[PDB]
Each structure stands twice: as structure tokens, then as C-alpha cells.
Curated annotation (Swiss-Prot), chain A:
Residues of the full protein shown: 30 to 87 of 361
Described purpose of this protein according to its UniProt entry: Plays a pivotal role in the control of morphogenesis of shoot organs by negatively regulating the expression of boundary-specific genes such as CUC genes, probably through the induction of miRNA (e.g. miR164). Participates in ovule development.
Compartments where found: Nucleus
Domain named TCP: residues: 1-58
Lineage: Eukaryota, Viridiplantae, Streptophyta, Embryophyta, Tracheophyta
Tissues in which the protein is found: Mostly detected in lateral organs, such as leaves and flowers. Expressed in cotyledons, particularly in the vascular region, in leaves, roots, stems, buds, flowers and immature siliques.
Subunit structure: Interacts with AHP1, AHP2 and AHP3. Interacts with SPL.
UniProt name for this protein: Transcription factor TCP10
From Swiss-Prot, chain B:
Task of the protein: Plays a pivotal role in the control of morphogenesis of shoot organs by negatively regulating the expression of boundary-specific genes such as CUC genes, probably through the induction of miRNA (e.g. miR164). Participates in ovule development.
Compartmental location: Nucleus
Domain TCP: 25-83
Gene that encodes it: TCP10
Complexes and interactors: Interacts with AHP1, AHP2 and AHP3. Interacts with SPL.
Name by which UniProt lists this protein: Transcription factor TCP10
Expression by tissue: Mostly detected in lateral organs, such as leaves and flowers. Expressed in cotyledons, particularly in the vascular region, in leaves, roots, stems, buds, flowers and immature siliques.
Organism of provenance: Arabidopsis thaliana
Residues included from the entire protein: 3 to 87 of 361
Length: 58, 83
DNA sequence: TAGTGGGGACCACA
DNA sequence: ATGTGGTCCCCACT
């Protein structure tokens, strides 16, 4: 049995993994590698930080 | 740039990059080639990151998380272009 | 029948 | 003791 935590979301508990489409993954990993991060999670942290102005308009 | 494979799945050119066909049939997902070599298209977000990311996905109204990553990359284009 | 998204499990580790 | 990152199979669907 797996012991990975899920997170609370507006639609219920959610697994912490995401599958990226091929084109999205290629662009995402370009960002991650240009940032020098070993863990993808740190790259989406950075994307969320840099997209904050747009996110707040949602 | 050149090579049929890393040495390995068949390397297939796509728009903006290259994908790698599955090397077997029990799992037929393609991988992608990146500056650090072949990579899986699936990533695990830390709990803190996942919560924020799904909030963005849910506020966008998107069914698939990959589309929310697309949106984030677009909205970050300014910061990305400066490295 | 070739590639998909996403569930469950597992390795190695703390 | 209860998580971790990352990935291996697998199921349903195309």
C-alpha cells in the first residue's frame, strides 16, 4: 500500500502527481533546466510565483 | 540534434523538440528529450506546490492539469525569456 | 494494438 | 512511522 499524501482541493482530495502532455513537458523542462532546479516541483513553484498577477485576475 | 536513440527508445522530432517512443508494450507512454536527457512526462508536486497548482487549475476551470501548466508557462513568458 | 490520462504499487530512503 | 521523489505496471479509452 502507498503512503503518499494527497492534498485538499476545491474538488476533493487529489494525488500530487501530474502527467504533462508531450509539448507541455518539453516546454516545462526547458524552464526547469534553465532555472537549474533538480526537482520539477520547484519549477512549478517558480511558475506560480511569476504568474501571480494573472492568477489574481482569475 | 542527431541520433536515432540515446544508445533506448526511438527519437521522434516534434514541434519545438523531440519525443522518445516507449521501449516496450506493457507501458506505451512516450517520454521527452530534454537538456538533461530523456525524462518522464509525469512529475510529483510537493504538497505545498500541489495545493497552489490545483487552486490555479480549478479557478481556470480546466479538466486536465497539463493545460494549467500550459497557461502558467504562457503567463510567465516574460520571466522565462530573461532565464 | 499505439498512445493517452491517471490509479495503485514499489524501491530506496529518511 | 509515516512520510518523500520518482517511476513501474496497469486499466479504460481512443
Amino acid at each position: 500500500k502507498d503512503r503518499h499524501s494527497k492534498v485538499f482541493t476545491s474538488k476533493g482530495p487529489r494525488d500530487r502527481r501530474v502527467r504533462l502532455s508531450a509539448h507541455t513537458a518539453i516546454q516545462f523542462y526547458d524552464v526547469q533546466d534553465r532555472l537549474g532546479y533538480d526537482r520539477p516541483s520547484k519549477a512549478v513553484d517558480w511558475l506560480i510565483k511569476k504568474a501571480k498577477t494573472a492568477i489574481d485576475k482569475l | 540534434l542527431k541520433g536515432y536513440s540515446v544508445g533506448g527508445g526511438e527519437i521522434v522530432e516534434v514541434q519545438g523538440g523531440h519525443i522518445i517512443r516507449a521501449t516496450g508494450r506493457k507501458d506505451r507512454h512516450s517520454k521527452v528529450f530534454t537538456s538533461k536527457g530523456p525524462r518522464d512526462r509525469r512529475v510529483r508536486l510537493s504538497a505545498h506546490t500541489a495545493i497552489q497548482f490545483y487552486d490555479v487549475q480549478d479557478r481556470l476551470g480546466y479538466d486536465r492539469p497539463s493545460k494549467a501548466v500550459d497557461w502558467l508557462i504562457k503567463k510567465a513568458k516574460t520571466a522565462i525569456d530573461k532565464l
